[PDB]
Amino acid sequence: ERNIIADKYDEASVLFADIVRFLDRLYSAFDELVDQHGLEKIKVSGDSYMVVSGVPRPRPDHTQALADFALDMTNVAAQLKDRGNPVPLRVGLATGPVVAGVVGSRRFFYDVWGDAVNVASRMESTVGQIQVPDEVYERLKDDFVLRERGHINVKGKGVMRTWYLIGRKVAA
Amino acid sequence: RNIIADKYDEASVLFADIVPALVRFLDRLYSAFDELVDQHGLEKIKGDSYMVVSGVPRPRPDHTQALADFALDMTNVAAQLKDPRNPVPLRVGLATGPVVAGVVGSRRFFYDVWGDAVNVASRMESTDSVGQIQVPDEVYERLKDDFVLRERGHINVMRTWYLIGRK
Ligand SMILES: [Cl-]
Ligand SMILES: [Mg+2]
């Protein structure tokens, strides 16, 4: 069985960046630059930021293009002060032959199926509110405070009395 | 195939929903939920919504109660944070009952890039001086007519330059 589909790109330029609510606004600004410059962000294991030029779409000006992007990048991080201090950004750029393409793996995660899953995920509307059916109310009433919402729609199921979960009771 | 599952006579389930980067905000939020799930000893269930189970895989007689405590902390954590515009419209549902639950393995595909240029660009950033763009000779040679670059020094073996700007 084959798990890689990849090609040699003889001509390619690679960029890594890193810092040594604000950070997300910055990375959002970088994300916007990638798209503006027509480049490719690569998802990497870590906190580092990887951008690639000349791949998957070759271009003869791959190094210059990545260079312009990197300059705009540092420019963006310069303008954005945080504590009021500038962002300590490292940027590295290299150029040379690479291999690139798609790799097959498997994602493992927990899942659940049953009426309870449906009921929990298909109750209509509310905000900041926690809504629960009778079977949950009966289990929580002695140690928590709830107030009846009333009869609502659970899509795929029907109409259902529900309660808003307000808070815990202080132990008596 | 691709599922290992078991019948659970009783379990409690939580579903939370929220109705361009912002992508990163919702990720940071789900990252805070993730930390909470671990704090409470619960399990996450896996696009624009978040699900949690209690009683799976580890049995506990207080599964609904533990989910409820988690859920109140969930709403409080969301209430603190705010998106970069508005408060976060978080709606939560809980239920309890018999379920089937376990691990799903789903084929995932990644677009990756390997080779010396990757290794070298990584070295260039890690050893970078803060505020600068560091590049080796091979980059220097391709940029030198159009960009200004000042030599920094040699790194362990290899010369590097600082990219300053266009001419
Ligand atoms: Cl070039
Ligand atoms: Mg199981």
Residue numbers in the entry:
A (entry chain B): 239 to 258, 274 to 335, 337 to 380, 383 to 428
B (entry chain A): 240 to 258, 269 to 270, 272 to 296, 299 to 337, 339 to 409, 415 to 425
From the reporting publication:
Rv1625c is one of 16 adenylyl cyclases encoded in the genome of Mycobacterium tuberculosis. Adenylyl cyclases convert ATP to cyclic AMP, and these enzymes are classified into six types based on their sequence similarity. In solution Rv1625c exists predominantly as a monomer, with a small amount of dimer. It has been shown previously that the monomer is active and the dimeric fraction is inactive.
Surprisingly, this dimeric fraction also crystallized as a domain-swapped dimer that was similar to the swapped dimer formed by the monomeric fraction. Clear electron density is observed for residues 240–428 of chain A (except for the β1–α2, β2–β3, α3–β4 and β7–β8 loops) and for residues 240–425 of chain B (except for the β1–α2, α3–β4 and α4–β6 loops). Comparison of forms 1 and 2 of Rv1625c-Wt shows that they form similar structures with small differences. When the protomers of each form are superimposed, it was observed that the other protomers are related by a rotation of 19°. Because of this rotation, the α2 helices of the domains come closer in form 2, precluding the space to accommodate a sulfate ion present in form 1. The possible explanation for the observed inactivity of the dimeric fraction is that it exists as a domain-swapped dimer in solution and cannot convert to the active dimeric state owing to strong interactions in the swapped form. The geometry of the active site is lost in the head-to-head arrangement of the domain-swapped dimer, rendering it inactive.
